[PDB]
């Protein structure tokens, strides 16, 4: 992939975060806190899961960014509609407005309905996310393995503005405290 030259500077939107998340001062890192983080509730916040959106909204063009997932046991990454459900239980699927991959219990899977098994030989420490709005494409790249393709969602029906999507995952095990970090360009 030669997608690096569509690189965009992504920052996290505090106001969308689950109330247990801690976003860094530079808005480039997020991690699970050990308690509720002393913020008011609002209609933007993901209530049931440790999720947060990027501040940027995309309705055209080609966009690329990279996320560091080093030492995490569980996470979800990708893009979603600006109008996704925030409150209650829901599944990550294109029908619900999400184009995502994840790590869960040592398996990587794409957020199709039902979910698709991914085949990754080299556990990634960084993930590249490529969106082509006009083509209807969301692609995922293994930066640790020379940029090798992980998954492509094609014929996507975005049906509105897109936002970068993140889930740091729960930390019941004590092995998933590490942050998601947006990597420098
Ligand atoms: C609805 C919700 N968002 S975070 C959260 N935690 C309590 C459950 C134990 N793990 C810590 C995070 N619950």
DSSP track, 15-75: GGS-TTEEE-TTSSEEEE-SS--S----TTS-SSSSEEEBS--BSSSEEEEEEE-TT-S-E
Whether ligand 1 lies within 6 angstroms of the CB of 170 is answered as yes
d(CA 9, CA 172): 32
Output the six-digit token pair for 72: 């995490």
Output the six-digit token pair for 75: 């996470």
Whether ligand 1 lies within 6 angstroms of the CB of 90 is answered as no
Whether ligand 1 lies within 6 angstroms of the CB of 50 is answered as yes
Neighbours of 22 (CB within 10 A): 15
**Closest by alpha carbon to 157, among 79, 87, 104, 90?**
79
Unique residue bearing structure tokens 């509730």: 41
d(CA 147, CA 3): 10
4-182 CATH, one of 3.40.640.10, 2.60.40.1260, 3.40.50.200, 2.60.120.920? 2.60.120.920
Cα angle value 137/11/182 (rounded, 5°): 75
3-state secondary structure of 1: coil
- Any residues with CB less than 8 A from the CB of 4 and at least 6 apart, and which? 64
Give the residue extent of every domain in the chain. 4-182
Unique residue bearing structure tokens 């909204």: 57
Output the six-digit token pair for 42: 């609002």
State the Rg of the chain over Cα.
Answer: 15
In angstroms, this model's resolution equals 1.5
Task: Return the sign of the alpha-carbon dihedral for residues 98, 147, 25, 167.
Answer: positive
d(CA 75, CA 124): 12
Neighbours of 163 (CB within 10 A): 22
Residue to mutate, 21, 32, 52, 170, ligand 1, most ligand atoms under 8 Å from C-beta: 170
């Amino acid at each position: 992939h030669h997608h690096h030259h569509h690189m965009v500077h992504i920052t996290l939107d505090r106001n969308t975060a689950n109330s247990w998340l801690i976003i860094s001062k530079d808005r480039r890192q997020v991690r699970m806190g050990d308690t509720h983080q002393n913020v008011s509730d609002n209609k933007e916040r993901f209530s049931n899961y440790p999720m947060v959106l990027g501040a940027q909204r995309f309705s055209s063009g080609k966009m690329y960014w990279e996320v560091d997932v080093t030492q995490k046991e569980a996470w979800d990454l990708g893009v979603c509609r600006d109008s996704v459900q925030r409150k209650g239980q829901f599944s990550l699927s294109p029908e619900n407005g999400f184009w995502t991959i994840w790590l869960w219990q040592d398996s990587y899977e794409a957020g199709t309905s039902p979910q698709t098994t991914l085949h990754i030989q080299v556990p990634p420490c960084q993930i590249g996310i490529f969106v082509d709005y006009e083509a209807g494409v969301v692609s995922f790249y293994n930066i640790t393995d020379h940029g090798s393709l992980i998954y492509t969602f094609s014929e996507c029906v975005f049906a509105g503005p897109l936002r970068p999507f993140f889930n740091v995952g729960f930390n019941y095990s004590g092995g998933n405290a590490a942050p998601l970090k947006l990597c420098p360009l």
